[PDB]
């Protein structure tokens, strides 16, 4: 079939204003992308609904307390001079802007990793020890009260985006990676990986019950190519970004296809970490060069011609103090769409 | 154009 083409922006670590996201959506539409992936929960949680109240664990937390707790969590992660969080009015505006330009929005609200702000929020809300021991970024899957609170928050974003979006990305990457890269391996040996399987399946059910398709990054799903801790819901679309490395033993793409998962090719050959121009990881020059080397359908370490549903080109703000660099973002988007034009139909 | 991969 025709394939989707997605531009992904990391607006969780770094605050983006509403008109900046509109300009990105306009560029994506101009260039023939079908979707924009708007990362909003990723270390920071930079979108707050008008009603964040939750009833969980037999307790009620009103909107005032939850919203204020999240705002403090954002400032604890990175008190961005440009802003803290987008509002619901702003997001309604952005979603209408995308709809008028034939662009679907894929939200990302990350858990159980990449949730510094929500962890601090839970601590302010009197939930004891929400973080996994040693981490400031990952929730403890052994802490049922913290996990259930997290699920209740995610559910609120699922409900909101269900009127607008087709896919909801719950993230699921890089467990406890502020400590080291061994988080998934340690969850497996400790036994808690069974509870990660259940958590992912619980979020998948929440998403499906709201009428959307769930998506996650690949690295923690069937880590070590091991299904003996439990099976994952095959309706979880796998955003496949890494084939792993030494001590980071992730399932190959074909493993997921054999189990019936769809693959969204998120090849990290296309990644750009903003501010890494000619030094560091995921450099600008390399991203551009790799857009004329990789096929649109080339998934890291995949057997040739595994089916995919589309591809995702990502810009990250690993260090959110780096400036906006829309000039480079737009060159990356221009180069991606020009090299992959036959898959990205425009007038 | 586009093929059938
Ligand atoms: Ca380089
Ligand atoms: Mg995560
Ligand atoms: Mg499965
Ligand atoms: Mg894996």
Author numbering:
A (entry chain A): 489 to 835
B (entry chain P): 2 to 6
Task: Please give me the paper's original passages concerning this structure.
Here we focus on EndoE, a multi-modular glycoside hydrolase secreted by Enterococcus faecalis, one of the leading causes of healthcare-associated infections. We provide X-ray crystal structures of EndoE, which show an architecture composed of four domains, including GH18 and GH20 glycoside hydrolases connected by two consecutive three α-helical bundles. We determine that the GH20 domain is an exo-β-1,2-N-acetylglucosaminidase, whereas the GH18 domain is an endo-β-1,4-N-acetylglucosaminidase that exclusively processes the central core of complex-type or high-mannose-type N-glycans. Both glycoside hydrolase domains act in a concerted manner to process diverse N-glycans on glycoproteins, including therapeutic IgG antibodies.
EndoE-GH20 crystallized in the P 1 2 1 1 space group with one molecule in the asymmetric unit and diffracted to a maximum resolution of 1.4 Å. The quality of the electron density maps allowed us to trace residues 489–835. The GH20 domain adopts the conserved (β/α)8-barrel topology with an overall size of 55 × 50 × 39 Å. A long and open groove, including a deep pocket, runs parallel to the protein surface and contains the active site. This groove is located at the center of the (β/α)8-barrel and surrounded by the loops connecting β1-α1 (loop 1; residues 499–505, pink), β2-β3 (loop 2; residues 530–541, brown), β5-α4 (loop 3; residues 598–603, orange), β6-α6 (loop 4; residues 660–670, light green), β7-β8 (loop 5; residues 706–724, blue), β8-α7 (loop 6; residues 729–740, green), β9-α8 (loop 7; residues 754–771, light blue), and β10-α9 (loop 8; residues 804–813, red). In a first step, D661 stabilizes the reaction intermediate and orients the acetamido oxygen for nucleophilic attack on the anomeric carbon to form an oxazolium ion intermediate. In addition, E662 acts as an acid protonating the glycosidic bond. Structural comparison of GH20 domain of EndoE with LNBase showed that the conformation and length of loops 1 and 8 in EndoE-GH20 could block the entrance of an extra carbohydrate moiety linked to GlcNAc (-1), confirming the exo-activity of this domain. The GH20 domain of EndoE cannot accommodate bisecting CT N-glycans due to the presence of bulky and hydrophobic residues in loop 7 that block the access of the additional β(1,4)-GlcNAc to the binding site, as in the case of the GH20A domain of StrH.
